[PDB]
Amino acid sequence: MGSSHHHHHHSSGLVPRGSHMQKPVVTLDDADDCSPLKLTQGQELVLTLPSNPTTGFRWELRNPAASVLKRLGPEVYSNSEEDSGLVGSGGESTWRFRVAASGDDRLELVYRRPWEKDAEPAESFSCAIQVR
Numbered sequence: 001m002g003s004s005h006h007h008h009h010h011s012s013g014l015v016p017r018g019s020h021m022q023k024p025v026v027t028l029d030d031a032d033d034c035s036p037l038k039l040t041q042g043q044e045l046v047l048t049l050p051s052n053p054t055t056g057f058r059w060e061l062r063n064p065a066a067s068v069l070k071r072l073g074p075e076v077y078s079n080s081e082e083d084s085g086l087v088g089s090g091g092e093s094t095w096r097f098r099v100a101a102s103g104d105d106r107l108e109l110v111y112r113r114p115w116e117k118d119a120e121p122a123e124s125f126s127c128a129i130q131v132r
Contacts, residue, residue, distance in 0.1 A: 023043045024037075024039065025037065026043060026045055026046055027046055029049055031127060033127065034126065035127075036128045037128065038132060039099050039102075039130065040099065041100060045069065045095075045099070046095070046096045046097070047094070048093075048094065049109075050092070050093075051093045052090075053089075053090055057112060057113055057122060058093065058111075058112075058114050059093050059109055059111055060111070060112050060121065062108040063105075063109075063126075065097075067105045068099070068103040068129075069129070070099070070100040071097055072097070102131040103130075105131070106128050107125075107127050107128075108125070109125040110123070110125065111123030111124060
């Protein structure tokens with residue numbers, strides 16, 4: 001045996017092989033990229049933010065961009081368990097949205113007790129959104 005051939009073969013696997021790209025973003029956690037993100041009628045939006053339901057201070061939904069984006073349903077908690085959704089704090093916040101129409105809008109979410117009214121939220125969040 002002396003044939004070394006040319007080029008290189010796949011043996012290390014440094015590229016993603018367990019993921020599929022189809023949506024633009026389908027998610028938004030960072031509050032820096034609040035730029036006028038472009039969307040398209042037919043793409044989901046499953047937000048993901050850290051929270052502790054063991055305290056009391058959750059994330060109040062102010063502007064869900066319902067002006068252009070349509071929500072699926074209130075149910076956002078899985079009854080069964082497959083990949084065990086437990087990071088180490090119990091339940092978490094999961095907002096599943098779906099685009100239906102275009103138009104300009106803006107998403108706004110604050111961090112405070114949902115059972116309150118115009119209270120003083122610790123954290124905050126608000127980014128821009130634009131569909132076409």
